[PDB]
């Protein structure tokens, strides 16, 4: 066959395993037949171009559908009352009741109500008409075409880059820090000053107007005279109606701090100043590394030079330059870990400090965004650790990393893993024990016997940031502190107004329930890290299989020889860490959603009192809030939440189906499929038809992967349905 053109070992397989493995190994270029390093890098480059084109097309489709089937123009008028519609529904299976139930948003045809917040985002950017969205979609289609053409072009013989170019670290770092990050944020500041702020103040600025419309009455004279403070005078009044000129100011750059009163989001002038400042900072950072001129550093020199003279790190960072530059998996792991941390930060900061107008009052949108980004963060962290393990298996060179930090990590992997296991057991034992203690005492009717620990440390941090709810009087809660006196006339007034009002999610009040769930989150993070770190460090070998690197990253097992070797691979460590990562993110999003739901309905006491025992979570969060969702459709009718109820049950179904693959293993199914093949061959009128690929049972690793995928899809879809439907049915 020539299906897996990249593997004759698969092309010559006479079973369906060929098709399955050709699917699952299509993007492992390193393992493909006759793969050279140059071809590997050039294919990755072209694939990146295609991926960027896909992203541009996806955003273009969002914009186009919101422009065509959306209600953006009538949403920009009363954004707090109009529901934003994502796209129209055309399903030939809907009944008239379903069409009527889904006809909402002020439109006259069934629609989906967006939970992505793109409406608020674009409104804040400066989009007001559907023509603006359509023009944006056109531009993104053009950009997708440009990037597809670039990907095709850079695969041509005279345009294919070389490896001396792919491994040029200094120039890439300089350009990414200065232009991709720095100048890009500077351009975003330029946009926010030329379009977003005038649009927020009711003055339309576009391509036909921006070359004649001054962003500031003084023009650029304050900039070119050094009187930069003139750009902060006359900010927007507290009675500014976003999108109109009533209450507007003339400032373009400020540091008011806090939130705009009406929109309840960060000041657009503050955002513009933020982006300008980080832009110049990044432009400066991008001039650090040496390029075709004499100035700059060399990363190899810095790494080799950095070795503490005490010798507690050995050779320090010698050889890491070559290791990282020659290992794409090391780079992939670093990038994935950093992006995962940044997306968690995006989630954590975007709910505490909303940046888009009126987004804070779109409760379902906020919960959906937070859950989305936390799940993405967990996926990225699991991927970072998996690719670290793959690097250890494939790209690690001990002789090169003779007694540097990496070799030392491998040296005391036993200590690392044992201490990680100890801290995991510590956290688990005691967190679960406190939860069970509270459960039992409350069950016996003695809630006063609960062990409720005040998160005094987090409360102290809040008070330091300026929260007066708790009496600590530390740094910014203290009016006579140096910290207060330093920023009293820049941002502290607004920041204190924001922090000390209970209208926002900025530094929500915390209690013993928060303490307990936080230590549950700590347990989850530590156990996921335990599994992933153990997989990465034992990937090359263990006492059971001291030659694992020979077998690779994702082999099934080593047989029942030494007492059993099931799940003895780093891939299997990843497979288990994915259950644990799904468990931890579930805990995190449960905590977030319940706290915010209780605050939104104003009964924060319900969380404060029921979060201390697991029956409280099971009853007052899941059981209590599942009512509208499970009533989406019922014997007496249906509403728009019927789709979410259906997806809820869909997630349950696929989750339980994944249980099949995870519990039942191959031999049973292989002996069953044998009988099935016998039956087909000896059935008249059906033996006229014959399989071209011998029907076989799924492989061990394949079954693990399929069960994991089913489990993950059930997890994600069930919680998406629950969160969105419950939020939409309660508010």
């Amino acid at each position: 066959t020539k299906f897996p053109k990249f593997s004759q070992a698969l092309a010559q397989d006479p079973a369906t395993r060929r098709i399955w493995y050709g699917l699952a190994t299509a993007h492992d270029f390193e393992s493909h037949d006759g793969m050279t390093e140059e071809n590997l890098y050039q294919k990755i480059f072209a694939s990146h171009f295609g991926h960027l084109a896909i992203i541009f097309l996806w955003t273009s489709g969002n914009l186009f559908h919101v422009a065509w089937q959306g209600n953006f123009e009538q949403w920009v008028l009363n954004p707090l009352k109009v529901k934003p519609v994502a796209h129209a529904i055309w399903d030939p299976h809907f009944g008239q009741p379903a069409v009527k139930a889904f006809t909402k948003g002020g439109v006259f045809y069934p629609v989906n109500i967006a939970t992505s917040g793109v409406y608020h985002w674009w409104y804040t950017i400066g989009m007001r008409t559907n023509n603006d969205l359509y023009a944006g979609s056109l531009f993104l289609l053009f950009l997708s075409g440009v990037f597809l053409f670039a990907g095709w072009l850079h695969l041509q013989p005279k345009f294919r880059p070389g490896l001396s170019w792919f491994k040029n670290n200094e120039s890439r770092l300089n350009h990414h820090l200065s232009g991709l990050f720095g100048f890009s944020s500077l351009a975003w500041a330029g946009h926010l000053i030329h379009i977003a702020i005038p649009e927020a103040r009711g003055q339309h600025v576009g391509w036909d107007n921006f070359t004649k419309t001054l962003p500031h009455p003084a023009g650029l004279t304050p900039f070119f005279t050094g009187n930069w403070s003139l750009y902060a005078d006359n900010p927007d009044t507290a009675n500014h109606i976003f999108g109109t000129s009533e209450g507007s100011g003339s400032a373009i750059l400020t540091f008011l701090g806090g939130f705009h009163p009406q929109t309840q989001a960060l000041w657009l002038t503050d955002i513009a100043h933020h982006h300008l400042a980080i832009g110049v900072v990044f432009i400066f950072a991008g001039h650090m590394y040496r390029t075709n001129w004499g100035i700059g550093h060399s990363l190899k020199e810095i790494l080799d030079a950095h070795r503490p003279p005490g010798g507690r790190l050995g050779a320090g960072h010698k050889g890491l330059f070559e290791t990282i530059t020659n290992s794409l998996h090391f780079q992939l792991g670093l990038a994935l870990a950093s992006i995962g941390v940044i997306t968690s930060l995006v989630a954590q900061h975007m709910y505490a400090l909303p940046a888009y107008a009126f987004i804070a009052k779109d409760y379902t949108t906020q919960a959906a965004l937070y859950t989305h980004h936390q799940y993405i963060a967990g996926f990225l962290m699991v991927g970072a650790f998996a690719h670290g393990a793959i690097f250890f298996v494939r790209d690690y060179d001990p002789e090169q990393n003779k007694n540097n930090v990496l070799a030392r990590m491998l040296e005391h992997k036993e200590a690392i893993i044992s201490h990680l296991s100890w801290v995991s057991l510590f956290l688990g034992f005691h967190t679960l024990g406190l939860y069970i203690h509270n459960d039992v005492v409350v069950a016996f009717g003695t809630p006063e016997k609960q062990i409720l620990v005040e998160p005094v440390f987090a409360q102290w941090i809040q008070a330091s940031s300026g929260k007066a709810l708790y009496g600590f009087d530390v740094l910014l809660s203290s009016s006579n502190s140096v910290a207060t006196n330093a920023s009293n006339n820049i941002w502290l007034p607004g920041w204190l107004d924001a922090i000390n009002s209970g209208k926002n999610s900025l530094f929500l009040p915390i209690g013993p329930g928060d303490f307990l769930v936080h230590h549950a989150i700590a347990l989850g993070l530590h156990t996921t890290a335990l599994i992933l770190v153990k997989g990465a460090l034992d990937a090359r070998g263990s006492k059971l299989m001291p030659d694992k690197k020979d077998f690779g990253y994702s082999f099934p097992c080593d047989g029942p020889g030494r007492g059993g070797t099931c799940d003895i691979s780093a891939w299997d460590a990843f497979y288990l860490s994915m259950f644990w990562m799904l468990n931890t993110i579930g805990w995190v999003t449960f905590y977030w959603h319940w706290k915010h739901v209780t605050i939104w309905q104003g009964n924060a006491g319900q969380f404060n009192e029921s979060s201390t025992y697991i029956m409280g979570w099971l009853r007052d969060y899941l059981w209590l809030n599942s009512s509208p969702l499970i009533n989406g459709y019922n014997p007496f009718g249906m509403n728009s939440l019927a789709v979410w109820a259906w997806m809820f049950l869909f997630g349950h179904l696929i989750w339980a189906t994944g249980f099949m693959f995870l519990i039942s293993w191959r031999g049973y199914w292989q002996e069953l499929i044998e009988t099935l093949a016998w039956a087909h061959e000896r059935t008249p009128l059906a033996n006229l038809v014959r399989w071209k690929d011998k029907p076989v049972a799924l492989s061990i690793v394949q079954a693990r992967l399929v069960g994991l995928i089913h489990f993950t899809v059930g997890y994600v879809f069930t919680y998406a349905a629950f969160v969105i439907a419950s939020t939409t049915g309660k508010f």
Partner: peptide, 30 residues
């Protein structure tokens, strides 16, 4: 508010992008 001519221009750009995507897919498959 979005006219059929606007939608047709969008479709033409989408078709151009599809042609380029097929070209890139071929080049990558090689």
């Amino acid at each position: 508010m979005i006219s059929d001519t606007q939608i047709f221009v969008a479709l033409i750009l989408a078709l151009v992008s599809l042609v380029l995507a097929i070209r890139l897919g071929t080049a990558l498959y090689q």
